């Protein structure tokens, strides 16, 4: 019998107007074997923090780990001071408080650690949570909204484990090149769970929370997914797709029809990324089973969802060029180890390594922001991965941007709205980006590749705003 899909608690402010998040180590069970894991308000993963546009929420964060961590609100438009990048250190056994002055549209964002050089490991150990932002607009739509019934978060992650059951994380020459990936897929921390969903429309809030693995969602029987939202919020209208690529750290919300009785699976399809199509990921891989039930639901697929502003005119905009690179020795050694271990299937569908990944010729330097961006002004950022064939989902803190061109082409319709991530893979991308909030040298915004092992080995830059 498949375990039921764990549903993260939807966390709102308490009596005192505060939200409390504890970061700690505990135990989880995978395939009948115990493993040390980390979680927010629990042993693994975390809650969904519920925020409202125009309202302030104070979060008290208690680090009960025996090492330093930070807490970053991925997708949130907040000042550098509360961004929780690598400078936002929470001492082990300590507490830091932040006030989130939420001022962006309804969206599914998320939160996770950003410890300098160790973010890959800290996510792999289990730290990730969700953010549900609501506004006046979205609540007027007749979208499915019964949390954990017909409005369901789906955090999809791979891991690998050693024979003793423990999470087998390493940042080594291979993983610094191609990323940390595993052979076991988790859905809100469970292996191939089932979710009982009302007949009618089911809303899934999908997060690719893998360190390095890209995903491609579809249904087992090829029924369509209706995309209603991306990283930064609602699309102007639903986009019908038969499959949905999702890069590391991206979110999409989809609606899917729930028939009367017969179950079906959400699946992920094999991707063309180095290392990611090794069995059992060489074939469609189940993510979770959806089991129809006959209980109350009234969610609908609306004809129109929202209104996007026009892209800003390109004339006069500051252009910033971000050249991603990997030391040729890392690229070659990394690919060699991958090929030697796994053989040709590692390419199906296609010297210190600790500072071998770079932007504009420089591995991340926490003490030296690369540039000062303007506040309240659209800029055009041009991000290139010409020079290697690794996947680089490029993510910029402090903003939700518009993609102008994604890796050689205009963005697909469902990726043309509000995004915090853009694909860079052997080509060049352009985003139109505005920062509404300040970030000083001491608490700078990060712009980085969200393949975490690249990030941890230097593919990140700091920038100030204001
Ligand atoms: Cu972020
Ligand atoms: Cu992130
Ligand atoms: Cu990268
Ligand atoms: Cu980040
Ligand atoms: O991130
Ligand atoms: O992030």
From Swiss-Prot:
Regulation: Ferroxidase and phenoloxidase activities are enhanced considerably in the presence of excess copper ions. A labile regulatory copper ion near the T1 copper site is important for the copper associated activation of enzyme activity. Ag(+) acts as a potent inhibitor of oxidase activity by binding at Cu(+) binding sites, blocking Cu(+) substrate binding and oxidation. pPD oxidase activity is strongly inhibited by sodium azide, an inhibitor of the electron transfer.
Practical uses of the protein: Triggering CueO activity at need by the addition of copper salts with minor toxic effects on E.coli cells could be used as a simple tool for biosynthetic purposes. The protein was also identified as robust host protein for use in biosensing and drug-screening applications.
Keywords for this protein: Copper, Metal-binding, Oxidoreductase, Periplasm, Repeat, Signal
EC assignment: 1.16.3.4
Residues annotated as binding Cu cation 4: 392, 449, 454
Temperature dependence: Optimum temperature is 55 degrees Celsius with 2,6-DMP as substrate.
Reported modifications of this chain: Exported by the Tat system. The position of the signal peptide cleavage has been experimentally proven.
Domain of life assignment: Bacteria
Residues that hold Cu cation 2 according to the record: 74, 112, 450
Swiss-Prot/TrEMBL catalytic activity: 4 Cu(+) + O2 + 4 H(+) = 4 Cu(2+) + 2 H2O
Disulphide-bonded residues: none
Knockout mutant characteristics: Disruption mutant is slightly more copper sensitive on complex medium than wild-type strain under aerobic conditions. Deletion of the gene does not affect copper sensitivity under anaerobic growth conditions. Deletion of the gene leads to elevated biosynthesis of enterobactin under conditions of iron scarcity when copper is present.
Subcellular location: Periplasm
Cofactor-binding details, from the entry: Binds 4 Cu cations per monomer. Contains a mononuclear type 1 (T1) or 'blue' copper site, and a trinuclear copper center consisting of one type 2 (T2) or 'normal' copper site, and two type 3 (T3) or 'binuclear' copper sites.
Top EC class, one word: oxidoreductase
Plastocyanin-like domain span: 26-136, 198-263, 351-465
Alphabetized InterPro entries for the sequence: Cu-oxidase-like_N, Cu-oxidase_2nd, Cu-oxidase_C, Cu-oxidase_fam, Cu_oxidase_Cu_BS, Cupredoxin, TAT_signal
Quaternary state and interactors: Monomer.
Domain comment as written in the entry: Contains a methionine-rich region, which includes a helix that covers the entrance to the type 1 (T1) copper site and blocks access to the T1 site in the absence of excess copper. This methionine-rich insert is involved in the binding and oxidation of Cu(+). It also binds additional copper ions, which are important for the copper-associated regulation of activity. The methionine-rich region provides at least three additional Cu(+) binding sites: Cu5 (sCu), Cu6 and Cu7, which play related but distinct roles in CueO oxidase activities.
Name by which UniProt lists this protein: Multicopper oxidase CueO
């Amino acid at each position: 019998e498949r375990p039921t899909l764990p549903i993260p608690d939807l966390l709102t402010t308490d009596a005192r107007n505060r939200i409390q998040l504890t970061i700690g180590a505990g135990q989880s069970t995978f395939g009948g074997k115990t493993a040390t894991t980390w979680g927010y308000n629990g042993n693994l993963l975390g809650p969904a923090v519920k925020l409202q546009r125009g309202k302030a929420v104070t979060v008290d964060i208690y680090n009960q780990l025996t090492e330093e961590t930070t807490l970053h609100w991925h997708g949130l438009e907040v000042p550098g001071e509360v961004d929780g990048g690598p400078q936002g250190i929470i001492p082990p056994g300590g507490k830091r408080s932040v006030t989130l002055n939420v001022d962006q549209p309804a969206a599914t964002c998320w939160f996770h650690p950003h410890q300098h050089g160790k973010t890959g490991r800290q996510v792999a150990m289990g730290l990730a949570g969700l953010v549900v932002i609501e506004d006046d607009e979205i609540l007027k739509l007749m979208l499915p909204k019964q949390w954990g019934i017909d409005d369901v978060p789906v955090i999809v992650q791979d891991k690998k484990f050693s024979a003793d059951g423990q999470i087998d994380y390493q940042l080594d020459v291979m993983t610094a090149a191609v990323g940390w990936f595993g052979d076991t897929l988790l859905t809100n921390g469970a292996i191939y769970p089932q979710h009982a969903a009302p007949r009618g429309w089911l809303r899934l809030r999908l997060l690719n929370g893998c360190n390095a693995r890209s995903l491609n969602f579809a249904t087992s029987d090829n029924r369509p997914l209706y995309v209603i939202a991306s990283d930064g919020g609602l699309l102007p209208e639903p986009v019908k797709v038969s499959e949905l690529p999702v890069l590391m750290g991206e979110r999409f919300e989809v609606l899917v029809e729930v028939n009367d009785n017969k179950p079906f699976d959400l699946v992920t399809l094999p991707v063309s990324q180095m290392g990611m199509a090794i069995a059992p990921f060489d074939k469609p891989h189940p993510v979770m089973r959806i089991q129809p039930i006959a209980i109350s639901a009234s969610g609908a697929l609306p004809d129109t969802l929202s209104s996007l502003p026009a892209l800003p005119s390109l004339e006069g905009l500051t252009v910033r060029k971000l050249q991603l690179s990997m030391d040729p020795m890392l690229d070659m050694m990394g690919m060699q180890m991958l090929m030697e271990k796994y053989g040709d299937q590692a390419m199906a569908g296609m010297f210190d390594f600790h500072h071998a990944n770079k932007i504009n010729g420089q591995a991340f330097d926490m003490n030296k922001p690369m540039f000062a961006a303007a506040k309240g002004q659209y800029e055009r950022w041009v991000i290139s991965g010409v020079g290697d064939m690794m996947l680089h989902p490029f993510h910029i803190h402090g903003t939700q941007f518009r993609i102008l061109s994604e890796n050689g082409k205009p963005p697909a319709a469902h990726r043309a709205g509000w995004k915090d991530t853009v694909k860079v893979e052997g080509n060049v991308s352009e985003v139109l980006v505005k920062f509404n909030h300040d970030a000083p040298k001491e608490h700078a915004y990060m712009a980085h590749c969200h393949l975490l092992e690249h990030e941890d080995t230097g593919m990140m830059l700091g920038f100030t705003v204001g």
